[PDB]
Design an enzyme around this catalytic site. Structure first.
Site, PDB file in Angstrom:
ATOM      1  N   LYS A  59      35.360  47.189  19.241  1.00  0.00           N
ATOM      2  CA  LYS A  59      35.102  45.792  18.863  1.00  0.00           C
ATOM      3  C   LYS A  59      34.236  45.096  19.902  1.00  0.00           C
ATOM      4  O   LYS A  59      34.609  44.083  20.506  1.00  0.00           O
ATOM      5  CB  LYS A  59      36.439  45.062  18.682  1.00  0.00           C
ATOM      6  CG  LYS A  59      37.276  45.644  17.538  1.00  0.00           C
ATOM      7  CD  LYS A  59      38.616  44.943  17.378  1.00  0.00           C
ATOM      8  CE  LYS A  59      39.595  45.359  18.455  1.00  0.00           C
ATOM      9  NZ  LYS A  59      39.913  46.824  18.393  1.00  0.00           N
ATOM     10  N   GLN A 172      52.304  45.060  11.034  1.00  0.00           N
ATOM     11  CA  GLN A 172      51.914  43.658  10.960  1.00  0.00           C
ATOM     12  C   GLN A 172      52.299  42.978   9.652  1.00  0.00           C
ATOM     13  O   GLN A 172      52.116  41.771   9.512  1.00  0.00           O
ATOM     14  CB  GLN A 172      50.411  43.528  11.190  1.00  0.00           C
ATOM     15  CG  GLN A 172      49.992  43.927  12.588  1.00  0.00           C
ATOM     16  CD  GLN A 172      48.489  43.825  12.758  1.00  0.00           C
ATOM     17  OE1 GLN A 172      47.913  42.752  12.581  1.00  0.00           O
ATOM     18  NE2 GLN A 172      47.841  44.945  13.095  1.00  0.00           N
TER      19      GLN A 172
HETATM   20  O1  LIG Z   1      41.936  42.458  12.975  1.00  0.00           O
HETATM   21  C1  LIG Z   1      42.212  43.506  13.510  1.00  0.00           C
HETATM   22  C2  LIG Z   1      41.316  44.400  14.191  1.00  0.00           C
HETATM   23  C3  LIG Z   1      41.766  45.535  14.723  1.00  0.00           C
HETATM   24  N1  LIG Z   1      43.120  45.919  14.657  1.00  0.00           N
HETATM   25  C4  LIG Z   1      43.533  47.193  15.233  1.00  0.00           C
HETATM   26  O2  LIG Z   1      43.937  48.078  14.217  1.00  0.00           O
HETATM   27  C5  LIG Z   1      45.112  48.813  14.621  1.00  0.00           C
HETATM   28  C6  LIG Z   1      46.307  48.411  13.776  1.00  0.00           C
HETATM   29  O3  LIG Z   1      47.461  49.083  14.327  1.00  0.00           O
HETATM   30  P1  LIG Z   1      48.937  48.868  13.765  1.00  0.00           P
HETATM   31  O4  LIG Z   1      49.294  47.410  13.658  1.00  0.00           O
HETATM   32  O5  LIG Z   1      49.043  49.651  12.363  1.00  0.00           O
HETATM   33  O6  LIG Z   1      49.838  49.568  14.735  1.00  0.00           O
HETATM   34  C7  LIG Z   1      45.175  48.634  16.128  1.00  0.00           C
HETATM   35  O7  LIG Z   1      44.372  49.599  16.808  1.00  0.00           O
HETATM   36  C8  LIG Z   1      44.593  47.256  16.316  1.00  0.00           C
HETATM   37  O8  LIG Z   1      44.069  47.045  17.625  1.00  0.00           O
HETATM   38  C9  LIG Z   1      44.051  45.094  14.023  1.00  0.00           C
HETATM   39  O9  LIG Z   1      45.215  45.410  13.960  1.00  0.00           O
HETATM   40  N2  LIG Z   1      43.538  43.934  13.483  1.00  0.00           N
HETATM   41 CL   LIG Z   2      39.785  48.205  15.589  1.00  0.00          CL
HETATM   42 CL   LIG Z   3      39.024  44.402  22.904  1.00  0.00          CL
END
Ligand SMILES: O=c1ccn([C@@H]2O[C@H](COP(=O)(O)O)[C@@H](O)[C@H]2O)c(=O)[nH]1
Ligand SMILES: [Cl-]
Ligand SMILES: [Cl-]
Ligand SMILES: O=c1ccn([C@@H]2O[C@H](COP(=O)(O)O)[C@@H](O)[C@H]2O)c(=O)[nH]1
Ligand SMILES: [Cl-]
Ligand SMILES: [Cl-]
Lengths: 209, 209
Positions: A59, A172
């Site tokens: 990102k 989440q």
């Molecule tokens: O808006 C966003 C952008 C990226 N991630 C990333 O996507 C993954 C989701 O992980 P989890 O919540 O299924 O464990 C993680 O690597 C997190 O940093 C999010 O969750 N939301």
């Molecule tokens: Cl990501």
């Molecule tokens: Cl970051």
């Protein structure tokens, strides 16, 4: 349609879990938690060991010049694609697109984030960030599983041909099925890698899909 | 363990056949017959359309400087790996390895060829070409399905950890099963793409495997 977010920080556990769920995926999203702990060489190791595509979850959100350097190092390390933040503006995104073109790789544009705080500043700019992506020729996007109405609006802006992946499933609160009404693939991290049986967790998600 | 050699020259037929056999593979070998006819852009189209890994069958065999240019253009076009001839010597192979390192890609070293004429000059140099590869750190090789005793000797030189792929199966007379006693994967072209039903031909090979 399932991408593993491999955010474990130790090489042995990351390798264990990824190998256990390999049959349910073909794309692994590797980010800073693993890379900062084990080094960038882990990307090529995964690519070789598992024969999966690797999306670098960096990102990028710096000025154009620095974004260029990060993208070059990331593709040199073997990543197939890199996720880039859109909030820093068009020039910062263009810098990443230029390196991806030079190296025959892809850029995914992150438009709206999945966590609660994303509503503070990112959400209000998300539609414009997505339109900017369309204007720049971006064909790969990232949107939130936690807000399917926002995911729907993002899909509307980018069109049906664009590829859209979505994190926020499971831990989440996002739902696989509802998210896949709009996204082409879902990103899942903790629901799989913290499970007592990661393979069974992945299989259960696949079944509902 | 099956790689499709897509040597059809027209885009529509190449896309048709590759799509029909996609479920039996995940790696497509694209060479000059298709690229010279439809352009280098066909590599990225295939990679995107089918989500397969692409090996560029260019068998580079020029001086170091030109080999570098060809490898750079090939990786810029999106290829995951490039096949390089070893007979031109170590410097020519090193030039390709340097670009692959810079771009996070792979080099496959072609050591002995599968056609009758390969016995004239290449066969006598093949063991040394393979040893040169080992000395240079090459980890991916190409050897002949048509001569399993030679494939065995090549495997002996490169070791069990090296990845070995082998063309000459089917049309040229090679056998899938016997070849896979030594190679990790077999390359198949005409037996699949000229078949009345390419999917059935691929399925039949997979079954015997
Ligand atoms: O808006 C966003 C952008 C990226 N991630 C990333 O996507 C993954 C989701 O992980 P989890 O919540 O299924 O464990 C993680 O690597 C997190 O940093 C999010 O969750 N939301
Ligand atoms: Cl990501
Ligand atoms: Cl970051
Ligand atoms: O020693 C070698 C090196 C490369 N190829 C290539 O591998 C493929 C084999 O195709 P086919 O005989 O299965 O149709 C073709 O692209 C051909 O150019 C060989 O056949 N033999
Ligand atoms: Cl070849
Ligand atoms: Cl040639």
């Amino acid at each position: 349609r399932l991408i593993l977010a491999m955010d474990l920080m130790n090489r042995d556990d990351a390798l264990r879990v990824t190998g256990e769920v390999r049959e349910y995926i073909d794309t692994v999203k590797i980010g800073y938690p693993l890379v900062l702990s084990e080094g960038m060489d882990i990307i090529a190791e995964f690519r070789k060991r598992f024969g999966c595509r690797i999306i670098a979850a960096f990102k990028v959100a710096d000025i154009p010049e620095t974004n260029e350097k990060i993208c070059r190092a990331t593709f040199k390390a073997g990543a197939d694609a890199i996720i880039v933040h859109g909030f820093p503006g068009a020039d910062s995104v263009r810098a990443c697109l230029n390196v991806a073109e030079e190296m025959g790789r892809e850029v995914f544009l992150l438009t709206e984030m999945s966590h609660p705080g994303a509503e503070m500043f990112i959400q209000g700019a998300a539609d414009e960030i997505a339109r900017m992506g369309v204007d720049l020729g971006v064909k790969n996007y990232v949107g939130p599983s936690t807000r399917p109405e926002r995911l729907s609006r993002l899909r509307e802006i980018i069109g049906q041909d664009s590829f859209l992946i979505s994190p926020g499933v499971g831990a989440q609160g996002g739902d696989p099925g509802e998210t896949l009404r709009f996204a082409d693939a879902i990103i899942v991290g903790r629901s799989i890698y913290l499970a007592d049986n990661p393979a069974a967790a992945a299989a259960g998600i696949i079944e509902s899909i």
